[PDB]
Every structure is written in structure tokens, then in C-alpha cells.
Enzyme design. Structure first.
Site, short mmCIF file in Angstrom:
data_model
loop_
_atom_site.label_atom_id
_atom_site.label_comp_id
_atom_site.label_asym_id
_atom_site.label_seq_id
_atom_site.Cartn_x
_atom_site.Cartn_y
_atom_site.Cartn_z
CD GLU A 23 -3.06 0.83 -0.03
OE1 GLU A 23 -3.17 -0.31 -0.52
OE2 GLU A 23 -3.79 1.76 -0.40
CD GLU A 75 0.86 8.91 -3.00
OE1 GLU A 75 -0.31 8.78 -2.57
OE2 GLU A 75 1.53 9.95 -2.81
CG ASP A 127 -4.60 3.16 4.78
OD1 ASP A 127 -3.74 2.85 3.90
OD2 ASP A 127 -4.62 4.25 5.43
#
Length: 446
Positions: free
Chosen positions: A250, A280, A433
Site C-alpha cells: 500500500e 501517487e 487503507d
């Protein structure tokens, strides 16, 4: 009957589509970043430390209560976000203790790995092992079903202090023009991945079916040699885990290109699965001349086609191939208004339900409901979109009754769904998450 909303129609189609895979994980191991977030009114905390209002003044490092007050007031005056390191260990312990004990302060499980572990642990037929800097407060906060090796238990927590202010809030001559927050910590453990060894060491006994790793981004700003040592520890550890055990990375909060480059070169081939957001993803494409490197920033909602070109390119440049000896076959992309699950064909099952499930948790967790409350959500994805900007791809139109869309592209399948975005969210820190954990829970490796 009257007509139902697009959102109620969509949440009904999810509830029919979503089901656990045929073969289920028994045991998942997760590490290594973890902390306790303490959310508190900044003005109240400073007042509670016995401080009168001074001057707003920025400080690169906070060495003292003065520095803290002065930088907080500086950002409160701007209504702007900031984050700082607080250098005095003992003084920080007393401030964090004061914040944590302050009546009405909120305490939350923090850190990508701990948040992932917590989401997995909600299911009682899945056994979770969690490593990271876990003190007595974080252990108390964690779900009882989460097993933390005694090796990974420590005397003190890593407190991250989140000092909020409201638009229009005042303290003496200070007035906030926007609501925002000032965050500070004295967190060397997460910065150095100090629990990586303890985590790696615990895997053999535990026999995970699934290994999930996070925290690499937190090494940003540490010695390049320390980073290199840790990335080699990661790759070595994974080569010692039995073949066919998926590892998910992750990836979050990155700004350093040397480090990102190194993670791509070294760690990507060692993992089965990757999870990340628009920030990202674009950052990856910027580093290694990818499909839309030219793009400086996403201009609103990220274009689905542009997103999919970058995911495609990653699995083509860095995913499993006849020649390459990479293990990367899966990317769970999650942004605010839609998620995509991209998979190299023939390595994964149940990816329709899995992406649907990732998207659904984004709604429910944001609103803090057990199920989707259709009054508090809103469909914000584009009504139509192209499946590739660069290549010639399909023109898709959103149908609320058939929300999960599939399309194929050179032996890689994409699975798209919009999000039911919580309009009045409690707190959406840590959502990526929980999304990645849900996506993996509902996935099956072949």
C-alpha cells in the site's frame, strides 16, 4: 412507489453483486506503520498548557512550547495546513499526554498498516497479525481480534497530535479565515521502519495467507543508505515467504523521486498487489516518463482513461511477464469519486465484487454507518468516460443499476465502479487503507 435516487439504485445493485470469494483467506499479516492520532482544538490545547497568545511565527522544527504556539498561530492565521517535527522528546511526551488526557479529545488508530489490520479484523473468520510501534494506548484502541506479537509491544505510543481550528475561530487577536489543522509528532519509529525486523521475524510462525506491507513512504527525508538497507530487508524477507503467498504494497504520501524510483525498481517485482490513489499514480508517471507525465496536476476528478493508461503502463512496464520475473499482477486504484481494480488476466478472481466492496466501504466508513445511508451519499463520478485517453477505447455511460463495468486491454482486465461519497463525513483520514483491505478481503488469488 416513486422513483428511487441513482444512489439508492446503485447501493441496491452493490448489495446483490457483493459476495465473499469461493476460497477465503484464514490469516493475514500486516505491517509496519502505526500510531495514535489525537484530534484536538489547537487553541484549547495551547490554552490548556497555560499559554497566553503570543505572535504568529513559522518555525521549521519545533523545539519548544513557544515554537509550537508560534507556528500554530502562524498557520491558524493563514487557515493553512502544516506538519512539523517536535524535537524535544520529554517535552513532547508531556504535551501529547496533555492532549490525549484533555476531555473531549478524540483518539484514533493511525498508520496505514494499523488501519489495514483494523479493517481486516472486523471479520471474525480472518485472523490478523499486526506489527508496528504499538504502545498501551494503541493496543487498547485496536480490535481485540488483532494479534500483536509481544516483540512488537512497547512502553510508549507514537502520538500524532492533530490541532484543528474552525473557520472564524478566535484567540485574542488571532482569527482563522478557514478551517484547517496543524499536525506535529516526534515519531522516529515509523520514520525508520524500526519494526520491519520484528514483523519479518514473526511471519514464519504465523504462516500468513496474505502479507500486507505499508510504511515505506514514511522513510521520506531519512538517510538514503537507511532507505536502501530497509528496501533490501523488504525484498529479502519476501523472497523467504513461501511461493504463491500474495504480498500487497500500500503506497501513500510520496514526494521524493529517488525513493519512488527505488521502490518501483526493487519492491514492485517482489509484490503481487499494489494499492494507491491519484496522487501517487500521477507521481509514478511523472518520475518514469509514463503515459501522462506531461500532466502537472489532475484538473478536478482524474480522467478515467488517463488513469487507466497509467495503470496499464505499470502492469506492462513492471508487472508479470514471460521474461521479467516480476510478481505484480494487481493494482487497486482508489480516488474520491471512483475506484478501479486492474488485473493481469488469469491470476485473480472475484474482482467485480471486490472493487464494489472497496467502493462501498468508502461510503459507509466515511459516514460512520454499518450500511449505506442513501440520504447522506452522492454519486460524483463522470456520467460518461473513455477507457483510454491515449489509445482508442470505449465510450462508457454510467448505469446506476449496473454500476461495476469491465473492459479488457491486451490481457489485462479493468473493473470500474463509482463511489457513493459521504456528503457529511465524520473523518475520512485512513479511507484508502480500509478500501484496500476490503478489496483484498473480497479478492481470491488463483
Amino acid at each position: 412507489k416513486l422513483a428511487l435516487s441513482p444512489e439508492s439504485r446503485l447501493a441496491a445493485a452493490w448489495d446483490a453483486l457483493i459476495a465473499q470469494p469461493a476460497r477465503r483467506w484464514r490469516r493475514v499479516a500486516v505491517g509496519v506503520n502505526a500510531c495514535v492520532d489525537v484530534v484536538i482544538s489547537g487553541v484549547k490545547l495551547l490554552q490548556a498548557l497555560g499559554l497566553s497568545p503570543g505572535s504568529g511565527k513559522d518555525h521549521a522544527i519545533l523545539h519548544s512550547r513557544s515554537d509550537l504556539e508560534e507556528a500554530f498561530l502562524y498557520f491558524m492565521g493563514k487557515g493553512a495546513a502544516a506538519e512539523r517535527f517536535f524535537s524535544d522528546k520529554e517535552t513532547f511526551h508531556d504535551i501529547a499526554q496533555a492532549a490525549s488526557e484533555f476531555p473531549g479529545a478524540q483518539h484514533y488508530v493511525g498508520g496505514n498498516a494499523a488501519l489495514i489490520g483494523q479493517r481486516f479484523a472486523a471479520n471474525t473468520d480472518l485472523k490478523v497479525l499486526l506489527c508496528g510501534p504499538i504502545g498501551p494506548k494503541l493496543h487498547e484502541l485496536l480490535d481485540d481480534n488483532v494479534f500483536v506479537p509481544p516483540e512488537s509491544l512497547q512502553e510508549e505510543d507514537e502520538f500524532h497530535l492533530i490541532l484543528e481550528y474552525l473557520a472564524g475561530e478566535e484567540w485574542g487577536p488571532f482569527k482563522a479565515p478557514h478551517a484547517n489543522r496543524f499536525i506535529f509528532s516526534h515519531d522516529l519509529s515509523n520514520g525508520a521502519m524500526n519494526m520491519l525486523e520484528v514483523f519479518v521475524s514473526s511471519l514464519e510462525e504465523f504462516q500468513p495467507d496474505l502479507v500486507v506491507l505499508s510504511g515505506l513512504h514514511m522513510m521520506e527525508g531519512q538517510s538514503k543508505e537507511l532507505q536502501r538497507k530497509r528496501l533490501l530487508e523488504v525484498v529479502t524477507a519476501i523472497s523467504d515467504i513461501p511461493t504463491g503467498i500474495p504480498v500487497h504494497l500500500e503506497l501513500a504520501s510520496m514526494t521524493n523521486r529517488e525513493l519512488m524510483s527505488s521502490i518501483v525498481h526493487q519492491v514492485f517485482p517482489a509484490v503481487a498487489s499494489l494499492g494507491l490513489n491519484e496522487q501517487e499514480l500521477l507521481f509514478l508517471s511523472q518520475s518514469a516518463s509514463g503515459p501522462h507525465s506531461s500532466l502537472s496536476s489532475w484538473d478536478g476528478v482524474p480522467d478515467v482513461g488517463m488513469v487507466s493508461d497509467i495503470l496499464f503502463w505499470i502492469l506492462k512496464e513492471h508487472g508479470r511477464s514471460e521474461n521479467r520475473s516480476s510478481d505484480l499482477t494487481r493494482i487497486h486504484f482508489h480516488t474520491l469519486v471512483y475506484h478501479i481494480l486492474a488485473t493481469v488476466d488469469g491470476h485473480w478472481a472475484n474482482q467485480l465484487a471486490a472493487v464494489a466492496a472497496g467502493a462501498r466501504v468508502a461510503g459507509t466508513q466515511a459516514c460512520a454507518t454499518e450500511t449505506i445511508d442513501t440520504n447522506r451519499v452522492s454519486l460524483r463520478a463522470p456520467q460518461e468516460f473513455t477507457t483510454s485517453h491515449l489509445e482508442s477505447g470505449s465510450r462508457i455511460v454510467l448505469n446506476p443499476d449496473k454500476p461495476v463495468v469491465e473492459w479488457h486491454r491486451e490481457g489485462i482486465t479493468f473493473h470500474f465502479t463509482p463511489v457513493l461519497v459521504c456528503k457529511d463525513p465524520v473523518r475520512t483520514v485512513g479511507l484508502g487503507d480500509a478500501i484496500s483491505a476490503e478489496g483484498l478481503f473480497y479478492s481470491e488469488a488463483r
